[model samples]
Target chain A: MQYKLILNGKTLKGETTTEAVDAATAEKVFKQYANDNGVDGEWTYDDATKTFTVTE
Target chain B: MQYKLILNGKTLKGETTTEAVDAATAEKVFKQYANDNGVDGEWTYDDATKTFTVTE
Candidate 1:
């Protein structure tokens, strides 16, 4: 997968970058994090860098 | 209170700097992140800058 994550938000969790992992795991972890914090993690998977970007 | 948190470690959660409501909530939130990630996040709160520092 070679997927990474970049979490963009207004809270403290903003500007967060995640290590490269599988695509599915990245989504799962992202979902859990967003759910816990009640943030609207709209994921727009970026293909250029194999990264999943979540903008709040 | 001008409380902030800096999460330092060897995981994706590291290098996390965020704002906190107060001292009590800061500690609780640090523990939650540590427990959830299976890391030892016994963060130390700095009085000078009101920054909570965490290490893996």
Candidate 2:
């Protein structure tokens, strides 16, 4: 599904998919994305849990 | 590079790759995967926040 998040007061769109990658790198990148974008409802990651938290 | 998730009465392996996708389509696909496979710990998505949930 498509998601709408706000970044820098501007709305940004994002998506997710199922492809293969190094799980470690994937988790790391996701966490980083969350930190960078979380403030604006961008992304969030739970490495140990393998779960994601997003904002509306 | 690989992760394991259960799907359809079997343990299915999964991976993540980072490339640019048409986010809209990607997100929709992910959510579908979740609904279809989440019970087996397959996938998940947030249409509003761009996050993922997976099971180990």
Candidate 3:
């Protein structure tokens, strides 16, 4: 199954091959991206839609 | 000792009764505010300045 991956609160819209991984890991990776890129935003994960939203 | 309390990632700029609280609560509260007010922004805390900054 393909999932739209969101990193750092930005809609990456990329496909993730990992099926078992949860939304929390997506959030963590997003935070890591924020720290690394100095981008500021809080990410919200919608499990049902598999969409990630970010606000700053 | 009084600490400057920042609630919801916005700078409250007021004195706090507690001195030992951490920055995470501020982040959570900010999220709550976002839910309540429909405002878009992420908050950052600066311990050295005892200040909170928000960006949209």
Candidate 4:
């Protein structure tokens, strides 16, 4: 599914996808992107909206 | 030569090197790494100190 990426309640400029529907798997997958982008915080995924969010 | 990386006067946890001693060339080379790590700022290099600095 196409998961929306959000940082601090705002949309981040990135496109990513994952087969996992749970938060743990999705967070694990996307944290690499966040780290690569020098972004650090809490990562979470919501199944209801299929959105991945990072918050400080 | 090994170039030290500084962000806002603080050292960043990274190691980089470049043959080009000029600021422009060094910035160009390291910008890719910064972009990948999601780091955004103005990049500069100092020939005397062999340091790469990023400022806000």
Candidate 5:
């Protein structure tokens, strides 16, 4: 399974690319990204398909 | 029905408290917190009981 981190809203101006094997992994990386870059928005994961999306 | 944001890692030194009515809300708020405070951690939501946890 693969997960992607899609930035949305003002955060989208920062970065628009990333990937992970699980939500937790995606979240861990996302946290780092959000913290390092000050990105804000919504983070969601689809368990059935193992996908992650961050939208504003 | 209720959700909480728990800081379980180095980010815990920044903040240790937060709440939300649902996972989406929790994620939105958590994203802001992470962006503002540079908090790196894991954000998880439980559907069976409606709970959110952020751990590093």
Candidate 6:
């Protein structure tokens, strides 16, 4: 499934353009994005839609 | 920077072969890996060596 890493900082907004094979992989990839950018948020996965969201 | 997702469950030992671009990104990605795989641990980044390790 394709994953989107939505990083909505106070003055910065970013996301990922890559796709992960599964929710687990997607989550890891998203975490990487967050770590590199020093963003804090929550991660949620939707099995019905195969989507992952990172709320900041 | 390169990152290693070390997933060491009670009876399961898993890891990732991919690397992240930076420390922040590596942390995010490591969290994702742990969340998806149901693994828990701590993430540490080495700035001097430019490496990330997830110990479970």
lDDT of each candidate versus the true structure: 0.54, 0.38, 0.45, 0.54, 0.55, 0.59
Ten contiguous residues with the weakest lDDT in model 5 chain A: A11-20
Docking class of 5: incorrect
lDDT of 3 by residue, B4-56 (tens): 43443344332322322234444555546555654446666664544554555
Residue-level lDDT of model 5, residues B1-56, one tens digit each, is 23445555663553343433234655787667766766667777664444456666
List the per-model TM-score of the A chain: 0.54, 0.34, 0.51, 0.58, 0.55, 0.63
lDDT for A47 in candidate 4 is: 76
| lDDT for each residue of candidate 4 in A1-56, tens digit (9 for 90 to 100) | 44555544122232344456466666675686455444456767677888876665
* TM-score for each candidate, following the candidate numbering: 0.43, 0.27, 0.34, 0.37, 0.39, 0.43
- Which pairs, if any, clash in model 2? A1-B27, A1-B28, A3-B47, A19-B15, A20-B15, A20-B16, A21-B15, A21-B16, A22-B1
lDDT tens digits, residue span A29-49, model 5: 554455455555566656666
Largest lDDT belongs to which candidate? Answer: 6
- Among incorrect, acceptable, medium and high, the docking class of model 2 is incorrect
Structure candidate 3, residue pairs in collision: A8-A30, A56-B41, A56-B55, A56-B56, B8-B30
- What would the per-residue lDDT of candidate 2 be over residues A1-56, giving only the tens digit for each residue? 22211122134344443233444456454445656754333333333224443433
DockQ of 5: 0.07
Q: DockQ of all candidates, in order? A: 0.03, 0.04, 0.04, 0.04, 0.07, 0.15
Among all windows of ten consecutive residues in candidate 1 chain B, which has the lowest summed lDDT? B9-18
Native-vs-model 6 lDDT? Answer: 0.59
Top candidate when judged by DockQ against the true structure: 6
For candidate 2, give fnat to 2 decimals.
0.00
lDDT of 1 by residue, B1-56 (tens): 54654544454232333356667776776567444434464568777787777665
- The residue-by-residue lDDT of candidate 4 on B1-56, one tens digit each, is 45555443123445556676465566676776676655556544444455554533
User: Where in model 6 is the C-alpha error above 4 Å?
Assistant: B1-56
Superposition TM-score, candidate 6 onto the true structure = 0.43
Q: Over the full model, what C-alpha lDDT does candidate 5 score relative to the true structure?
A: 0.55
